[PDB]
């Protein structure tokens, strides 16, 4: 079974296929400025953070979300 995995940078989606219980290959990190890069998340707000190294791909279409912080 392959899925699609949504990257959604503020809104940007970029659609990849996925073999359900496979390991994701992480995109290369986006970049906003000004801000910094916390990861893939599996909500925009209240979710959780993805492990690439960690984390099987799902048997179902799913997004995650580029969570960023502001410089300090
Ligand atoms: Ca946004
Ligand atoms: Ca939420």
């Given at each position: 079974m392959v899925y699609?995995?949504?990257?959604?940078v503020d809104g940007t989606v970029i659609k990849t296929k996925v073999e359900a219980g496979t390991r994701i290959t992480?995109?290369?990190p986006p970049t906003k400025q000004g801000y910094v890069f916390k990861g893939w998340?599996?909500?925009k707000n209240g979710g959780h953070e993805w492990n690439f190294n960690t984390d099987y791909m799902s048997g179902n279409d799913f997004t995650l979300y580029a969570v960023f912080?502001?410089?300090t």
């Open positions: 699609t995995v949504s990257y959604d992480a995109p290369k998340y599996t909500e912080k502001a410089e």
